[PDB]
């Protein structure tokens, strides 16, 4: 089975430097030509840099935006795919995925070129009503705010919790913060014996956070 | 550089229907083109290359035609699992070039939202910032307005709005929108309401509360 895996990825400054790699196996390598694409809500996919085979002198080729900037290389032997990116500017961010030209591609990882420090964020209950319908359904959640750079995951009740559950897309707020919310659903009558717990987890802060959620007392 | 234009940009279809979707070169392309499924957080997956060759471990109901500058994805029926958003790329040239996609969702019946609010938290309120979250649960279509009103106040400019997709438990639409005040504005005000329309409901719902009651 052909697996590829990005890494290098993280929080850097512009005008910073990062080198990405890919790992690959499963094809023989040196016989493959290999691609960098990213991808970002704003500009869509993107091609970045193209590297020949060895029967082709590991040729190269780069997308304008890149040009100067950004190198591709490869080391056969270690069956690896790099691309150093020098003198990055805000717009390098996104996700960037290592692709055997376009037959199969990594996971990617995520390239953040901010000014802004890494904060990990705080996270707040929404609290099920107190007016909620007896022998109906409740709702409750909770606020994962002020948060950078991307990304955080939500699960309840270490994963045994999964029906009902809505986790937002992150929004940025005009403070440069992202914030989310992960809401369930769950029965009116099942908010005094059960017990709900919301497991935030923002790798690139070093930060997780298990929060319970009851009804607020009165 | 060689311009790849996707149509339609989104569109829906029932489970079962044949789907049809166009990629159109600026040039002639040769028939050097690839198409990709991606889903959200997942990185994309190829199904055609060189126009119409199927990729191993792709279903056969997916075949791409076309020629010179006219491509066409059909999935010839529709699976649940097909939903997405599907991607055109021409590697005749460098550079190397993508469509923006064309998104594809499944069609179901219309559901209207149950409707929630969330006061801030007293542990939010002691930093100085109020958040007051609503929620639109289980809804189909997509369309729908949320209005927040403080003290009757309609609020414009303050709050945030995200949603769900479909995916492979939930066929509805599920959206939170979240109101930004300062703790000295929250103190200041008494009554807190978001006012939700949607198609699925016969008259607008409102969910309101009353700062500092139960």
């Known amino acids: 089975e052909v697996k590829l895996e990005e890494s290098g990825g993280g929080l850097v400054q512009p005008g910073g430097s990062m080198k990405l790699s890919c790992a690959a196996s499963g094809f023989t390598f040196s016989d493959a030509w290999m691609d960098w694409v990213r991808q970002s809500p704003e500009k869509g996919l993107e091609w970045v840099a193209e590297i020949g085979n060895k029967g082709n002198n590991h040729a190269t080729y780069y997308a304008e935006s890149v040009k100067g900037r950004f190198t591709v290389s490869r080391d056969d032997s270690k069956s690896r795919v790099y691309l150093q990116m020098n003198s990055l500017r805000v717009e390098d961010t996104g996700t960037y995925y290592c692709?055997?030209?376009?037959?199969?591609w990594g996971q990617g990882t995520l390239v953040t070129v901010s000014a802004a420090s890494t904060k990990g964020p705080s996270v707040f209950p929404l609290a099920p009503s107190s007016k909620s319908t007896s022998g109906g359904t409740a709702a409750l959640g909770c606020l994962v705010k002020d948060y950078f750079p991307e990304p955080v995951t939500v699960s309840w009740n270490s994963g045994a919790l999964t029906s009902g559950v809505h986790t937002f897309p992150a929004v940025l707020q005009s403070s440069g913060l992202y914030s989310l919310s992960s809401v369930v659903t769950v029965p009116s009558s099942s908010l005094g014996t059960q017990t709900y717990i919301c497991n935030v987890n923002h790798k690139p802060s070093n930060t997780k956070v298990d929060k319970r959620v009851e009804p607020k007392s009165c | 550089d060689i311009k790849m234009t996707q149509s339609p940009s989104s569109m829906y279809a029932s489970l079962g229907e044949r789907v049809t979707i166009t990629c159109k070169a600026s040039?002639?392309?040769?028939?050097?083109l690839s198409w990709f499924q991606q889903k959200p957080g997942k990185s994309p997956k190829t199904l055609i290359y060189?126009?119409?060759r199927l990729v191993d471990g792709v279903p056969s109901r997916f075949s791409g035609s076309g020629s010179g500058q006219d491509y066409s994805l059909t999935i010839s029926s529709l699976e649940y699992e097909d939903m997405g958003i599907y991607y055109c790329?021409?590697?005749?040239?460098?550079?190397?070039?993508f469509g923006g996609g064309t998104k594809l969702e499944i069609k179901r019946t219309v559901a209207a939202p149950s409707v929630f609010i969330f006061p801030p938290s007293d542990e939010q309120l002691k930093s100085g910032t109020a958040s007051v979250v609503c929620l639109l649960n289980n809804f189909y279509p997509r369309e729908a307005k949320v209005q927040w009103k403080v003290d009757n106040a309609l609020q414009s400019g303050n709050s945030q709005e995200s949603v769900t997709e479909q995916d492979s438990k939930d066929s509805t639409y599920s959206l939170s929108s979240t109101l930004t005040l300062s703790k000295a504005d929250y103190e200041k005000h008494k009554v807190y309401a978001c006012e939700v329309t949607h198609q699925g409901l016969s008259s607008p719902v409102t969910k309101s509360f009353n700062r500092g009651e139960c």
């Open positions: 060189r126009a119409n």
């Open positions: 790329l021409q590697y005749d040239e460098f550079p190397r070039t």
């Open positions: 692709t055997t030209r376009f037959a199969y």
């Open positions: 040039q002639d392309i040769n028939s050097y």
